[PDB]
């Protein structure tokens, strides 16, 4: 089997991407944030505290003839941005882009943190990291991809995120028309539950490539590119007037600037992030100070190849017995 679904930016900055997901019988379609940095499929629901729902579409398990309460199971998650959610668990039929999993754990939110409530466009998350990170207790549950894998034509999914435009998540096949050149594959460590890999270095603009190992995670659920402070300083030094602002929370730059590209290495291959992908717009409405798309990871504990990096590539998440990642230009 295969599946193919369009993923759409939630706003004009590409802050996140939403993909329609069919849950239950008859189908209830919710727009979920596919997140290769986490492993829970959770949704706003008829159980979510009413004051914490503000425009999201909800899953109502009582209206699904295939929903079954997973007795005794609860979940609770906290994300790297400080947001969180928790609740109980159903199993139900879940379909993405024509690919159907029966008995998928659907984690129904009883509580969500304010950042979720305040984003009416995201109805939940669909985790695509390794199932070892799934938070369901007392019996950990499998991700949608883990449940689908054995049925897929090939045990892979691909992320093809657009810049200011829709893109595609495919399951079970490589669309060889969706990228240019070849796909360069690179080793993955699953020891932390992430799609963790090592970039071979970077360049700023037309500058020379610096060969250096940068361990980080491929994370579709993180907007920005978080890299070591040395690398980030080297990038922003090429933007006149850019500076790190403690009060804003990162590097800012004059909105009048033209940003240089940023290249990262995948083995001997190179992925070029155009400068425009690094502009996240005014820090507040009407400001001439703009927020940068490359930020320091120093306070995170891990480097994160988020959407800024991934949307410059066609990315293969190869879930074979020994997982690997592939990157191609497009």
Do residues 270 and 256 touch, judged by C-beta distance below 8 A? no
> What's the 3-state SS for the chain?
CCEEEEEEECCCCCCCEEEEEEECCCCEEEEEEEECCCCCEEECECCCCHHHCCCCCCECHHHCCCCEEEEEEEEEEECCCCCEEEEEEEEEEEEECCEEEEEEEEEEEEEECHHHHCCCCCCEEEECCCHHHCCCECCCCCCHHHHHHHHCCCCEEEEECCCCCCEEEEECCCCCCCCCCCCEEEECECCCCCCEEEEEEEEECCCCCEEEEEEEEECCCCCCEEECHHHHHHHHCCCCCCEEECCCCEEEEECCCCCCCEEEEECCEEEEECHHHHEEEECCCCCCEEEECEEECCCCCCEEECHHHHCCCEEEEECCCCCEEEEECC
- Within this chain, do residues 169 and 207 fall inside the same structural domain, yes or no? no
CB 318 within 8 A of CB 170: no
Q: Decide which of 174, 196, 221 is a domain's last residue.
A: 174
Whether 11 and 159 share a structural domain:
yes
- The answer on 112 and 11 residing in a single domain is yes
Asked if residue 90 and residue 16 are part of one domain, the reply reads yes
Cα pseudo-dihedral 293, 190, 264, 303, rounded to 10: 40
What is the rounded distance in angstroms from the CA atom of residue 22 to the CA atom of residue 3? Answer: 12
Last residue of one domain, picked from the residues 159, 174, 189:
174
CA–CA separation, 295 and 132 (whole Å): 28
What range does the domain containing 190 cover? 175-330
Residue keyed to tokens 């804003």: 248
| Residue 65 exposed, middle or buried by CB count within 10 Å (0-12, 13-18, 19+) | exposed
- From first CA to last CA, the distance across the chain in angstroms is 25
Q: Which among 118, 146, 174 is the end of a domain? A: 174
Give yes or no: residues 42 and 96 share one domain. yes
Same domain, 93 and 36: yes
Which sign does the torsion angle of CA 207, 209, 210, 216 carry?
positive
Same domain, 218 and 251: yes
Whether residues 115 and 190 fall in one domain: no
Give the experimental resolution in Å: 1.0
Angle of CA points 105, 58, 109, to nearest 5°: 50
CA distances from 44 to 11, 56, 77, 243 (A): 20, 7, 14, 38
Distance in angstroms (rounded) separating the CA atoms of residues 283 and 260: 20
> Into how many domains does the chain fold?
2
The answer to whether residues 62 and 143 belong to one domain is yes
Task: Write out the catalytic residue numbers.
Answer: 35, 199
Compute the distance between CA of residue 330 and CA of residue 328 in angstroms, rounded to an integer: 6
166 and 24 in a common domain: yes
Which residues, other chains included, contact 208 with Cβ-Cβ below 8 Å and sequence gap of 6+?
A: none
Q: What angle do CA 313, 217, 300 make, to 5 degrees?
A: 125
183/291 same-domain check: yes
Pairing of strands 68-78, 167-171: unpaired
CATH code, domain carrying 125 = 2.40.70.10
Elucidation method: X-ray
- On whether both 170 and 183 belong to a single domain, the answer is no
CA 98 – CA 169 distance, rounded (Å): 12
């Amino acid at each position: 089997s295969t599946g193919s679904a369009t993923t759409t930016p939630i706003d004009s900055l590409d802050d996140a991407y939403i993909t329609p997901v069919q849950i239950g019988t008859p189908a209830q379609t919710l727009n979920l944030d596919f997140d290769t940095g986490s492993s829970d499929l959770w949704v706003f629901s008829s159980e979510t505290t009413a004051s914490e729902v503000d425009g999201q579409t909800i899953y109502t398990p009582s209206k699904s003839t295939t929903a079954k309460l997973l007795s005794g199971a609860t979940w609770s998650i906290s994300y790297g941005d400080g947001s969180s959610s928790s609740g109980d668990v159903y199993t139900d039929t879940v379909s993405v882009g024509g690919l159907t999993v029966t008995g998928q754990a659907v984690e129904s939110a009883k509580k969500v943190s304010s950042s979720f409530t305040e984003d009416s466009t995201i109805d939940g998350l669909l985790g695509l990291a390794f199932s070892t990170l799934n938070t369901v207790s007392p019996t950990q549950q499998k991700t949608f991809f883990d449940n689908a894998k054995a049925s897929l034509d090939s045990p892979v999914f691909t992320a093809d995120l657009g810049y200011h435009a829709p893109g595609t998540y495919n399951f079970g096949f490589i669309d060889t028309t969706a990228y240019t050149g070849s796909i360069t594959y690179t080793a993955v460590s699953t020891k932390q539950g992430f799609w963790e890999w090592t970039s071979t270095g970077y360049a700023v603009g037309s500058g020379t490539f610096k060969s250096t190992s940068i361990d980080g995670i491929a994370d579709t659920g993180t907007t920005l590119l978080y890299l070591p402070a040395t690398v980030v300083s080297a990038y922003w030094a090429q933007v006149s007037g850019a500076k790190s602002s403690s009060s804003v929370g990162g590097y800012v730059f004059p909105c009048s600037a033209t940003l240089p590209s940023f290249t990262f290495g995948v083995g001997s291959a190179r992925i070029v992030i155009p400068g425009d992908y690094i502009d996240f717009g005014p820090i507040s409405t009407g400001s001439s100070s703009c927020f940068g798309g490359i930020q320091s990871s120093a306070g995170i504990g891990i480097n994160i190849f988020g959407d800024v990096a991934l949307k410059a590539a066609f990315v293969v998440f190869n879930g074979a017995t020994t997982p690997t990642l592939g990157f191609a230009s497009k």
